[PDB]
């Protein structure tokens, strides 16, 4: 009358695991031919009394996702026209179309020589560039010689104007044998034993918005402003702040752009900026002044909760370096905007119908990722572009020291790309299902 | 009386299904070095009293054939020398030979600047081209400026002289879990029940013959001419006529053409017609006149059953469009022919040896599959060639609309590559095997 | 009494079968991301009472290794800068820096018109070339009109200096359902039964060493020198000789080269030898003389067991062809050496410190294998190259017959890659596991 081994199959047991995930949908760079529609009825367990500890920054789903994004960008860019043939000496002069003082030096007009439909023939041609797309190549020879910024490094590629960069949300789905755990704790600290967990087969959709200093168009915190950091005393690491109210931002490139097209080679079309008509004004973004101040007050109080009381907090501008890190960056319509944050991070805090305008600059030749293996040229956009978006979170860093609970200074970060999604995927964990278990009893 | 449920596994149950098929091998475009070995002994199994209803035009096997053929052309074409380096201004003069009346203006002697093995040495070269391959740039001035017709669109690419275009038949095979149903009925016109069926694992081989107006080298009807269409009253549809008697056609290019070649670059070579030995004459095809007349009369005999009686039936030439929809196009020896069919579709039939010679045109720069993303240069063929082939069927277009609903007139059509394959795929359907089923009984 | 058919599953039965193998490592050419982590436990299991016949030269593990090296080289070279913009003529003269009469005219001082980052600018540049890399034009006015030797074939490609070509060993692993059976018999040559065997899931690592005459860094024979051949009576097959005495060989390129680089196109970097600091010296390899004599004497003792006794044996050098089949071709440090081994094969054997110095040639443009549809360049190496390797075996051929079938003579040659790897893979056989079988017994 001893005990014996009994085998049970179909046991509800989890193991931490890393596997691949499927792409699921609700031309376009992400919503591609090899991504499938989801089933819109998640089979949740409605929070049974299961407690599970998990965290951010160690969730390798992020890394897989990051790699997929890079792959999608390259796949859509491979069958596109090389702009290599355009790496020629350029001749720039001053642009003369009623440019205001604030815009002097922003645009340059170059003439150049280029190939065309027939190999032995070359046609003089001209185009308009933003100053940031070119460099001066020789004061000694004269004062008009320029080249495109990336002609001395990997080739610049552009075509496929028909492909959308609209951030269509993508869902991730588990393979059979796997499941995704989901945290419903709206007070979750980013690392702890989430008491409110469920299971899904697919995550909700996440918009692949790529940005630097401010996170746009993400999930909104539902109850309160929250803060996430791997280590609060680590001043090398970034701090993620999720807002519980959106900040509405109105951006524009208020200039009417004519788009021109020429052929470089055999069906090798090139699109470029033609005349800009009307006068020339600076690109910019507006935020409600009142809402921004309200937003910061909430952020400051939340920061204080992780510091002592009456901590004096300051906001300030970035350290410089590449424009990508220096400024806020986003894409809209295929256009690339680099915006100053001087009107956003300036004020200080104490223990006790207007707007903010941020000037913006435009770039066309961009090293999209942190690697310099390739380069992409943005197509021009015909007409006038206006964009409206929601700030859902901030990326801040602490200065490398503060003194005696004062002048605690935060500045825009955005140095990593991965936190653009860590901020969305923090609610999920991936586990393997291990249906085979053993538990003893008394039987024949 | 109280009966229970049993489960049967290995149940003979069918479901319609959409899956893919394999390949058949026993180089060229289709029966490639990466093609599945064929089945030396497929087993056809007659099914006692199975009647199966199926439809042509709902048969996805056609679409699979289409996509595979396109893929195979691209795989074959990809590792070829591009002819972009030859997209130069051509200085054109006449042909110093005995030119017949119908060949004057058909050929031009083009000279040009060409590259050599080293990028500092350039030479003058010349080649003969067909008129359809060459376009006038500036008729005003120069009176000598010409280029290849597709140098202002996607590049013309083609070399790979070692690869044949022989339409080697490919057998399609189903994966395990699937079966192919073959219809043995000899009256059915593709929309309805088939009282005599059998199943196979693999189909017989199907030859991917390129065609337009006339269907060459297809399987022949065994008992009667069958005219098949999606909707008889819909004049926007193509009409497939499958003959029960072959009509022999003999084509020639009676010109002892000599192939010359140049080295363009680093292992980059191009072949073209240089000298022509003997007189220059137009390519042509012969169709037995007597056979055609009787054969067409048989088609008419059947049209009189599909349509009403005492209707005069007429045949006429197509109305227009580019060469690819006005001529009978076919491949022979890797070369592409575009033959006039006016001597064939010219008759009136009422209810109450010799030969047809068809003049042909030659096009070397080809925009195959109506795809505008690429073009190919068929290589020249050394010497005089002959083509012998069988006419198995026709694609007709009924001219819809008539005062008092009389005198039906038909014109050749067939401007869809998918409609050629219908002639062999119409006999097959793909089925998923469903081995599980449930039925009632007396057990407990 | 009567025995019934019975079924046993889990039966230890082998079949001779061919499948592919998994790559496991120990970036590089071979140790790429597409390779499995090192087997932590090469759990070898010796088999009692098992004898199997392992005929090598039937062993298709060789063919799989052959295909893998070719594919890996292509994957590594694929993204590298091409040398097509360098296929121009050059103005060459004799470079001078205290060059002896033996090397006189071997190294050239050449100039050419280079493309710069901007395609519309050209400059004159200098670099050094070895005579074996370049060819002249005789009749076209003057001799200083050199071109690279392979600009008449597939583009010469090479860059990616960061990639290591060090022959890091790779392990092969069986797929599930398969096992690798290893021969433990130290006396085993390549044919017939092996009385002592064991199995593994993974083999030890094998270094992908490329060689034409002297097999370098390989498995050593442990008891005796072993002579292996598919056929030991004809003169059609190569003779594979494994030594049991490693022979140390010291190779050098005694030239303190300086490396210079340019940009030709968009990040399209090119590297070349610039000057040489200090005077120029002849490349060579040093073999201990006594060791070599002992080595050959041991080979002779073994030849006498396949051949008769009291036979005079003579050695001679390769009959000729390109350097790849005439010299000892090997790579070290990325440099390609072509060493004259006649000094190793200029002696006779009879019926009953002091070094050997072998002069070497250096080549930069290579074709890797025996295919001529590809060409590669080689980077210059900065500084002096000193290499130390172990001669593990010889690839020998026998001369095609002799008077009275006496005085046998031998020569190095037959340097096919396939025959090098035979010396490492002869120990292994791959079999399939067939767990199911029938063995009748008494039952109901």
């Amino acid at each position: 009358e001893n005990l014996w081994v009994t085998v049970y199959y179909g046991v509800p047991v989890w193991k931490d695991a890393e596997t691949t995930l499927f792409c699921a949908s609700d031309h376009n760079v992400w919503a591609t031919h090899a991504c499938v529609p989801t089933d819109p009825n998640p089979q949740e367990i409605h929070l049974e009394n299961v407690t599970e500890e998990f965290n951010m920054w160690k969730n390798n789903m992020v890394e897989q996702m990051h790699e997929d994004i890079i792959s999608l960008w390259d796949q859509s860019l491979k069958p596109c026209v090389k702009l290599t043939p355009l790496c020629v000496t350029l001749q720039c002069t001053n642009v003369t179309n009623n440019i205001t003082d604030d815009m002097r030096g922003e645009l340059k007009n170059c003439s150049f020589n280029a190939t065309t439909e027939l190999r032995n023939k070359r046609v003089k041609r001209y185009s308009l560039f933003y100053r940031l797309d070119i460099v001066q190549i020789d004061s000694n020879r004269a004062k008009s010689h320029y080249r495109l910024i990336n002609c001395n490094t990997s080739a610049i590629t552009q075509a496929c104007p028909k492909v959308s960069f609209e951030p269509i949300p993508i869902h991730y789905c588990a393979p059979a044998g796997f499941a995704i755990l989901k945290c419903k704790d709206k007070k979750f600290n980013g690392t702890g034993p989430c008491p409110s967990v469920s299971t899904v087969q697919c995550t909700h959709g996440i918009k692949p918005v790529v940005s630097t200093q401010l996170l746009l168009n993400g999930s909104l915190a539902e109850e309160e402003v929250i803060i996430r950091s791997e280590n609060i005393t680590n001043n090398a690491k970034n701090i993620l702040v999720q807002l519980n109210t959106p900040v509405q931002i109105n951006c524009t490139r208020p200039n009417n752009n004519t788009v021109k097209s020429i052929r470089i080679g055999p069906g090798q079309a090139f699109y470029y900026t033609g005349d800009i008509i009307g006068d020339i004004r600076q690109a910019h973004c507006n935020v409600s002044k009142a809402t921004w101040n309200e937003t910061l007050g909430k952020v400051v109080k939340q920061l204080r909760k992780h510091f002592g009381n009456n901590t004096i907090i300051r906001f300030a501008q970035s350290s410089g370096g590449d424009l990508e890190v220096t400024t806020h960056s986003f894409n809209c319509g295929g256009e690339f905007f680099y915006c100053n944050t001087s009107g956003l991070f300036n004020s200080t805090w104490i223990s006790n119908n207007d707007s903010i305008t941020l000037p913006c600059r435009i770039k066309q030749i961009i090293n999209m990722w942190q690697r310099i293996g390739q380069a992409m040229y943005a197509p021009p956009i015909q007409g006038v572009i206006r964009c409206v978006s929601n700030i859902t979170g901030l990326i801040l860093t602490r200065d490398g020291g503060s003194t005696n609970s004062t002048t605690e200074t935060f500045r825009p970060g955005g140095g990593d790309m991965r936190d653009n999604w860590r901020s969305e995927l923090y609610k999920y964990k991936v586990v393997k299902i291990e249906p085979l278990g053993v538990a003893p009893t008394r039987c024949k | 009386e109280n009966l229970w449920v049993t489960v049967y596994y290995g149940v003979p149950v069918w479901k319609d299904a959409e899956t893919t098929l394999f390949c058949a091998s026993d180089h060229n475009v289709w029966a490639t070095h990466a093609c599945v070995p064929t089945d030396p002994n497929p087993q056809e199994i007659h099914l006692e009293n199975v009647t199966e209803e199926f439809n042509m035009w709902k048969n996805n096997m056609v679409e699979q054939m289409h996509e595979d053929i396109i893929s195979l052309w691209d795989q074959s074409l990809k590792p070829c020398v591009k002819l972009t380096p030859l997209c130069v201004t051509l200085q054109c003069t006449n042909v110093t030979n005995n030119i017949t009346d119908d060949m004057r203006g058909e050929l031009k002697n083009c000279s040009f600047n060409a590259t050599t093995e080293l990028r500092n040495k350039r030479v003058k070269r010349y080649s003969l081209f067909y008129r359809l391959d060459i376009v006038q740039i500036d008729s005003n001035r120069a009176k000598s400026h010409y280029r290849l017709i597709n140098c202002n669109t996607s590049a013309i690419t083609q070399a790979c002289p070692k690869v044949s275009f022989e339409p080697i038949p490919i057998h399609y095979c189903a994966p395990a879990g699937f079966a192919i149903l073959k219809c043995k009925d000899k009256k059915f016109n593709g929309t309805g029940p088939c009282p005599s069926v059998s199943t196979v694992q693999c189909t017989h081989g199907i030859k991917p013959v390129v065609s337009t107006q006339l269907l060459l080298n297809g399987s022949l009807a065994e008992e009667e001419v069958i005219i098949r269409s999606e909707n008889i009253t819909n004049n926007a549809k193509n009409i497939l006529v499958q003959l029960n008697t072959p009509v022999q056609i003999n084509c020639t290019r009676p010109n002892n053409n000599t192939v010359k070649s140049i080295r363009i670059g680093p292992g980059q070579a191009f072949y073209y017609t240089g000298d022509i030995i003997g007189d220059i004459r137009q390519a042509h095809c012969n169709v037995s006149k007597a056979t055609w007349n009787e054969t067409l009369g048989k088609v008419v005999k059947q049209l009189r059953k599909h349509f009403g009686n005492n209707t005069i039936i007429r045949f006429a030439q197509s109305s227009g469009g580019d060469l690819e929809v006005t001529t009978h196009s076919f491949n022979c020896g890797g070369e592409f022919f575009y033959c006039n069919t006016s001597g064939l579709f010219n008759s009136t039939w009422i209810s109450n040896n010799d030969s047809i010679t068809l003049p042909c045109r030659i096009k070397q720069i080809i925009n195959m599959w109506q795809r505008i993303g690429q073009a190919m240069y068929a290589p020249p063929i050394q010497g005089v060639i002959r083509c012998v082939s069988n006419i198995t069927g026709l694609i007709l277009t009924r001219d819809g609309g008539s005062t008092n609903s009389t005198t039906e007139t038909f014109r050749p059509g067939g401007g869809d590559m998918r409609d050629n394959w219908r002639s062999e795929l119409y006999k097959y359907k793909v089925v998923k095997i469903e081995p599980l089923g449930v039925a009632p009984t007396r057990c407990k | 009494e009567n025995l019934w058919v019975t079924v046993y599953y889990g039966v230890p039965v082998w079949k001779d079968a061919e499948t592919t193998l998994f790559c496991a490592s120990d970036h590089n050419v071979w140790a790429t991301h597409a390779c499995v982590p090192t087997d932590p436990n090469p759990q070898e299991i010796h088999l009692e009472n098992v004898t199997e016949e392992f005929n090598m030269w039937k062993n298709n593990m060789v063919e799989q290794m052959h295909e893998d090296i070719i594919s890996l080289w292509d994957q590594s070279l694929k993204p590298c800068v091409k040398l097509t913009p360098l296929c121009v003529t050059l103005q060459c003269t004799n470079v001078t820096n205290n060059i002896t009469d033996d090397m006189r005219g071997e190294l050239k001082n050449c100039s050419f018109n280079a493309t710069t980052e901007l395609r519309n600018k050209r400059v004159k540049r200098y670099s050094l070339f070895y005579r074996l890399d370049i060819v002249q034009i005789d009749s076209n006015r003057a001799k200083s009109h050199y071109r690279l030797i392979n600009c008449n074939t597939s583009a010469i490609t090479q860059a990616c200096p960061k990639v290591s070509f060090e022959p890091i060993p790779i392990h092969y692993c069986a797929p599930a359902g398969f096992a690798i059976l290893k021969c433990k018999d130290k006396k085993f040559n390549g044919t017939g039964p092996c009385p002592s065997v064991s199995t593994v899931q993974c083999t030890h690592g094998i270094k992908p060493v490329v060689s034409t005459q002297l097999l370098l860094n390989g498995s050593l024979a442990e008891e005796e020198v072993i002579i292996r051949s598919e056929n030991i009576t004809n003169n059609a097959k190569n003779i594979l000789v494994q030594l049991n005495t490693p022979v140390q060989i010291n190779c050098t390129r005694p030239n303190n080269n300086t490396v210079k680089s340019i940009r030709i196109g968009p990040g399209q970097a090119f590297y070349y030898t610039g000057d040489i600091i200090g005077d120029i010296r002849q490349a060579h390899c040093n073999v201990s003389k006594a060791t070599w004599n002992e080595t050959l004497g041991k080979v002779v003792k073994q030849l006498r067991k396949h051949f008769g006794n009291n036979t005079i044996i003579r050695f001679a050098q390769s009959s000729g062809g390109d350097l790849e089949v005439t010299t000892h071709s090997f790579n070290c440090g990325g440099e390609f050496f072509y060493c004259n081994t006649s000094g190793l094969f200029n002696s006779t054997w009879i019926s009953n410190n002091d070094s050997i110095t072998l002069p070497c040639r250096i080549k930069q443009i290579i074709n890797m294998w025996q295919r001529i549809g590809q060409a590669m360049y080689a980077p210059p190496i900065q500084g002096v190259i000193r290499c130390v390797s172990n001669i593990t075996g010889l690839i020998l051929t026998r001369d095609g017959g002799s008077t009275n079938s006496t005085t046998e003579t031998f020569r190095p040659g037959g340097g096919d890659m396939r025959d090098n790897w035979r010396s490492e893979l002869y120990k292994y056989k791959v079999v399939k596991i067939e767990p199911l079988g029938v063995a009748p017994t008494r039952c109901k």
Partner: antibody, heavy 136, light 109 residues
Framework: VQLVESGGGVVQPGRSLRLSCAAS????????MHWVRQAPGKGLEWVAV????????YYADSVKGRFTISRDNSKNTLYLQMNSLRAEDTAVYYC??????????????????????????????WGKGTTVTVSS | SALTQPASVSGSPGQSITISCTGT?????????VSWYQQHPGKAPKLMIY???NRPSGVSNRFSGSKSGNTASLTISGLQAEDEADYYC??????????FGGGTKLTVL
């Protein structure tokens, strides 16, 4: 390959006159053009030159303020508008083409904007001339 | 304004004669844009030499030319009756205008 002048009428002093060169047989629109005049018994005097877009117009000082050069790329026609004609302006006026073409440099032909030819700096094609007379 | 050129030149048939023309920095000592024309009376002029010594297609090899400093020179070797035409020198100037010389009458006797 012809330049045909017309409009060589007779006017009173101080009156205007329009000449027109009916160019034909060449891509007129791709070539620069000139007007030259020669009074009876006198040598050749240059009057004016015009570019494809007209972006460049130069005149002899002697005709400045009295002569305007213009053109029609499509009608293949060159024009000269004379104003306030002086007795001294009586001359045979000629239409002449500026030579030029592509520039064969560094292996590849180079062309101006809209594929216009560049200038080789010497007149090549000449017309026949027409006579412009100021009466007295 | 005009280039200096002799009113007339002369020589016997079959002889080589040259016609000089003098400009300034803004011609021959400023550009190679220096040309010569032959004008048979009653006709528009035709180009004989351009680019100092260039030969238009159709012009005989007995016609040549040179420059030195600000002086241009047209060479007519082997004078014939067909050469009794006015000769003109001209230049594309700095100022992008065309300057002509006075015109030389050649008599062959």
């Amino acid at each position: 390959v012809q330049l045909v002048e017309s409009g060589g009428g007779v006017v009173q002093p101080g009156r205007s006159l329009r000449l027109s060169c009916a160019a034909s047989g060449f891509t007129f629109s791709s070539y620069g053009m000139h007007w030259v005049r020669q009074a009876p018994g006198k040598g050749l005097e240059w009057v004016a030159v015009i570019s494809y877009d007209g972006s460049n117009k130069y005149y002899a000082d002697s005709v400045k303020g009295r002569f305007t050069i213009s053109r029609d790329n499509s009608k293949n026609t060159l024009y000269l508008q004379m104003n306030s004609l002086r007795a001294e302006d009586t001359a045979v006026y000629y239409c002449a083409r500026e030579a030029g073409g592509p520039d064969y440099r560094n292996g590849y032909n180079y062309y101006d904007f809209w594929s216009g030819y560049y200038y080789y700096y010497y007149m090549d094609v000449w017309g026949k001339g027409t006579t412009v007379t100021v009466s007295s | 304004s005009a280039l200096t050129q002799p009113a007339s030149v002369s020589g016997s048939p079959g002889q080589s004669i040259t016609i000089s023309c003098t400009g300034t920095s803004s011609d021959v000592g400023g550009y190679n844009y220096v040309s010569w024309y032959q004008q048979h009376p009653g006709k528009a002029p035709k180009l004989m030499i351009y680019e100092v010594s260039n030969r238009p297609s159709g012009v005989s090899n007995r016609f040549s030319g040179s420059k030195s400093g600000n002086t241009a020179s047209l060479t007519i070797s082997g004078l014939q009756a067909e050469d009794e035409a006015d000769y003109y020198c001209s230049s594309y100037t700095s100022s992008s205008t065309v300057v002509f010389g006075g015109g030389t009458k050649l008599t062959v006797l």
